[PDB]
Design a protein around this ligand. Structure first.
Ligand code: PEX
Ligand code: PEX
Lengths: 607, 608, 95
């Protein structure tokens, strides 16, 4: 729907010097043909930025047309055009003019000049009063599915995302209008946030992003030395490290976490090396915004806010791996105390459901069951109230939080039905019992032997498709068999066919015996074909020579980050990790010490 | 058996200067022994092209043998032999002589000269009056499963297919008789068609074909600027782009679709870049004979006429992917309205079958059922009348049409029998009901999640393993029945089959041991056959095949769109042309289609 | 020297057939020489036209007409797991 930004074949829409003559002159690049434009503007009292000299739908001015038609990086009409604009006395300069269409809103000639990689044009524009903080905020420049190009929204951000060091240096160090590193787009994303967003985990793109991130950190150490760029938070409250954690950009996240500089750039480092002895290397890691002591940390963002498949690979990176290991070692006793409490509760549940001072003890057991159901209901509801989005964004590693809530709800319903003397309380009680015994498997993640999936992913994906196909088959054959016997009702026939399909029962077979037999044979063969299809489709993922340890570590990380908050009835005070050491200039940080042994890496440094 | 073209060991078939002496002389290459041949020919009143001086079967002349026996790229007897022929007063010169055998029909000395890669021989033959438009119509030069070499039929096409740029340049630019790029073989195939037909999807052959195609296009633009070579249609009615689409030549079809040139050859381009901004590139694609508005479009040829396994790889190329996506987005509502109508009809079917003032409602349901069956039968019959070829050439993606037709036929027959009050109407009705419920899975292709979600193998393994299993079943059934005489062949077959699929159980009487042995043997043999089933099906999975399910779904959507675009059989739908008319060079106005491409990986490869 | 038979009645070509030595077997079957050593060859090129190459293969001790030929030795006297790879060699395949 939006018109092309530039089209050699299609003329601009319209939604002496007319617009077409001027646009043809600036497109061909000859400046001598511009004579008479200024006189015409003076005579008609017009201005070069009026709607009569712009594209109707967007607002593309003549200058932007000139920049879009650069030849060898230069266009001879730009400087005379700006001179004509200045001589015309235009109250709003032709430079800094921007589009108004929703797709290209905010787009200016400086963005075109930077994108075309013409440093000369950038110099010419900035000299003539180009604003270097103009924001291109149209739909084309926003991050979404479809045709778009997100680079931030500032000229400095566009130059950074396009790998232009000369243009970035000029913009930062020009005297006419210096660009600001701490400038933000409409979303509050600075140049570092823009670099994080444009990054994908491919090696070359990661190398480019890392290179320009480090270069911009050094440039922000040179200029404005009193400003800490990495601490700037966008409108979502995310620093570049936290934004990388949320977006699942593992490469830049790892680089930022383990960033180490030598020489003058030491304060920019986050990893400090303490001592080495052969293959043993000991380093300090900065826990700024990483420790879960603070609200909305990197650990919490990775556990509960990230949704990328790279999520489990981030928790094994240092210092996250060692930090989470220390937390798990600290809280391993609380985990198994919870396991023992649940085991005792389930034992009482089993005894009470089985046996329906004996009578008084049974009543006491029922009271204890109701109290446990009430407690678990309150705990699960609070968990959902706190982490509603985590359930939706990753069901594959959070369904136990739903099963516990369902078990508590069923227990409460069974008890209240028993109070109302209803006879439908036994089914709810037995479902509660079986669901609790199933949920007992949650605590198998506490030890490695049972804690350490592939079929769980495919079933949660293909369940709906396979159910749709098999239910279409089942309904068709059930109605076909029921209609021919006039197998009492549709539900009974469907139950019979399903029980035969899963091998629980035989098939019943009255004239038209041959047709009933043919229908049953067709059903059996079709279901065998469908099950074989399912088996092979599940098989194709296993044989790919494909990380269970990382998933188990992520599970332990989630369990630890949930256990740190304490119970709902008792908030637990958190402890800062590491110690407040001085690393430079009083540059005091909450560093964390990690010892690492690597024979293979050390043996390569030997002659 | 056709005789060898030039055998150093086998003498030419028959079937002073005799033929054998002349053939020996021209094979040696020394022209001195040719002296006296003209005098003998004049005295005996004979020409070099007569029947006795040629191979009996093919009609190969001494000139062809001289060209066949080129040494170091030249044969010194060529010019003396031609001089003797022209001095003999031959009314039909030896240069234009051609073979007569059905295998080598149309073969000439110029063809041999071009094949031998001897430019000197080609120049010498052309200078002496060789016709550069002779067509080799023999079976050796046609394309068929066997010993054949198809290069078109013209010398220019032979030179183009053999990567001889000098020969092509001379043939098109010689003053004696300039070759024409518009010339066509027996099938109507020009040089571009011949290049398309010899194309193989291997990278080397594709590169050779692309290079020669571009070179010939540019050289034709230079020599014949008033004509368009890509618009010439053969006897099948296909342009080179459409010929590549039909035959499955993907790697040249893509190149033709996305051809782009800058400079003097821009009018030959089909992709025109409008603007670029970072990783975003926007280009105009020429929809000439690509859009389904025209008859025999590229889309229709790929969907319904192509039989190559590369069908689904072709509908994912630009601009075909974007064009089909836009067509689907325009016709997505019509698809689901059809789904809703079919669902309502099937619901009425289920109600009527289940319920076999209430009587009036049942009669209304019956007549609605008959009308629905009639509508589907007419709709499917028209589809087959239009696409008789598509069902046969590809069953894996057209069996749902057959199922719909069968459901309609069964519904109509069931209603007819119900009117006739035949007792067999109910089985037909229930079979129609179950078949129509199974046909409801056609519409899953509308939405991607289940649309993307063995079928190829079942036409490749079942037709063999059912033969083996039926041999086993019949043998053991007759063995059991004859020993028990289980009371009939069909009874034993049914019991054994039901046990095999696990549905039934076997029942064991004199010779109980032999019966038990037979049953054990049958069970073990069937278990081995089922293991072979499972292993054969498994090996196709560990083969590490690519994820082409997405492309197959796109091709299914393309077929559904191209059939929905014609409208219903009772109401022809007006065609909507895609793209807009734009000027792209010189009065050269084309119907271009705008496609926008975002590619970070490609763009980053251009940065320093 | 090719026609000398050992105590088992096998020429070097037949011995290579029996023992399953596929590489030397193919080389002996498809032996081609130019110039002075042409008579020692077993394969002769007749004519070539583009991709089509036509050649003559010597059928001495290979055709089943002779008793104890290469074909019979491969079919019934060889025990190597390479037998099915030998029947697809020229001129055995077309014969
Ligand atoms: C009558 C007792 C009333 C409760 C008083 C508090 C006792 C301590 C509570 C406790 O340890 O709870 C453990 C557990 C927590 O749920 P989870 O995080 O394992 O679950 C979340 C997993 N996603 O919760 C349970 O296992 C609930 C069981 C409640 C009854 C315990 C009977 C024995 C008490 C000594
Ligand atoms: C008796 C109807 C008289 C004509 C009235 C017009 C009704 C519209 C028909 C229609 O859109 O077709 C629906 C469907 C065709 O499936 P398909 O060709 O897409 O599938 C092609 C598969 N290869 O065909 C059917 O579902 C057949 C039954 C149509 C009537 C259903 C009752 C509801 C009408 C509103």
């Amino acid at each position: 729907e939006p018109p092309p930004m530039e089209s050699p074949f299609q003329r601009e829409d319209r939604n002496r010097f007319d617009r077409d003559r001027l646009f043809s002159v600036v497109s061909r690049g000859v400046p001598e043909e511009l004579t008479g434009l200024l006189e015409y503007l003076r005579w008609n009292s017009k201005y070069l930025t009026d709607s009569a000299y712009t594209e109707g739908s967007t607002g593309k001015t003549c200058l932007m047309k000139a920049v879009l038609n650069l030849q060898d990086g230069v266009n001879a009409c730009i400087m005379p055009l700006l001179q004509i604009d200045k001589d015309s006395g235009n109250p709003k300069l032709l430079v800094n003019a921007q589009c108004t269409d929703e797709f290209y809103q905010g787009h200016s000639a400086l963005h075109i000049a930077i994108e075309k990689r013409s440093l000369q044009c950038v110099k010419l524009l900035v000299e003539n009063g180009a604003d270097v903080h103009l924001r291109a905020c149209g739909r084309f420049f926003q991050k979404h599915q479809g045709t778009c190009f997100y680079f931030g929204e500032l000229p400095l951000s566009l130059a950074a995302c396009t790998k232009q060091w000369d243009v970035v240096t000029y913009l930062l160090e020009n005297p006419h209008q210096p660009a600001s590193l701490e400038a933000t787009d409409s979303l509050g994303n600075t140049v570092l946030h823009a670099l994080v967003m444009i990054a994908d985990n491919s090696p070359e793109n990661s190398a480019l992003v890392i290179h320009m991130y480090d270069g911009l950190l050094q440039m922000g150490a040179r200029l404005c030395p009193t400003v800490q760029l990495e601490e700037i938070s966008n409108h979502q409250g995310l620093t570049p490290l936290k934004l990388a954690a949320k977006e699942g950009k593992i490469e830049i996240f790892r680089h930022i976490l383990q960033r180490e500089f030598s020489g003058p750039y030491q304060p920019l480092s986050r990893k400090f090396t303490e001592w080495c002895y052969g293959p043993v290397r000991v380093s300090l890691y900065d826990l700024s915004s990483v420790d879960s002591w603070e609200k909305n940390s990197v650990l919490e963002i990775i556990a509960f806010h990230c949704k990328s498949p790279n999520r489990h690979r981030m928790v094994v990176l240092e210092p996250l791996n060692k930090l989470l290991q220390e937390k798990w070692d600290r809280l391993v006793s609380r985990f198994f105390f919870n396991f023992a409490c649940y085991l005792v509760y389930m034992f009482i549940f089993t005894v009470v459901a089985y046996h329906q001072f004996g009578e008084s003890m049974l009543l006491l057991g029922h009271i204890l069951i109701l109290l446990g159901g009430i407690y678990l209901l309150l705990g699960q509801l609070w968990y959902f109230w706190r982490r509603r989005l985590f359930i939706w964004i990753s069901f594959m590693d959070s369904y136990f939080e739903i099963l516990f809530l369902l078990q508590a709800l069923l227990t409460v319903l069974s008890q209240v039905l028993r109070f109302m003397e209803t006879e439908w309380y036994l089914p709810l009680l037995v479902l509660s019992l079986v669901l609790g015994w199933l949920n007992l498997l949650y605590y198998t993640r506490g030890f490695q032997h049972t804690g350490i999936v592939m079929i769980q992913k495919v079933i949660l994906r293909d369940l709906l498709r396979f159910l749709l196909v098999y239910l279409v088959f089942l309904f068709g054959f059930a109605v076909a068999l029921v209609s021919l016997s006039r197998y009492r009702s549709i539900l009974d026939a469907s139950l019979e066919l399903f029980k035969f399909t899963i091998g629980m029962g035989e098939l019943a077979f009255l004239r038209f015996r041959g047709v009933v037999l043919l229908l049953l044979l067709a059903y059996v063969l079709l279901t065998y074909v469908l099950l074989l299809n399912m088996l092979i489709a599940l098989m194709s993922e296993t044989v790919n020579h494909v990380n269970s340890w990382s998933i188990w570590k992520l599970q332990k990380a989630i369990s630890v980050l949930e256990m740190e908050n304490g119970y709902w009835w008792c908030r637990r005070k958190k402890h800062r990790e590491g110690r407040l050491l001085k690393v430079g200039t009083p540059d005091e940080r909450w560093c964390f010490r990690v010892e690492e042994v690597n024979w293979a890496a050390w043996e390569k440094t030997l002659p």
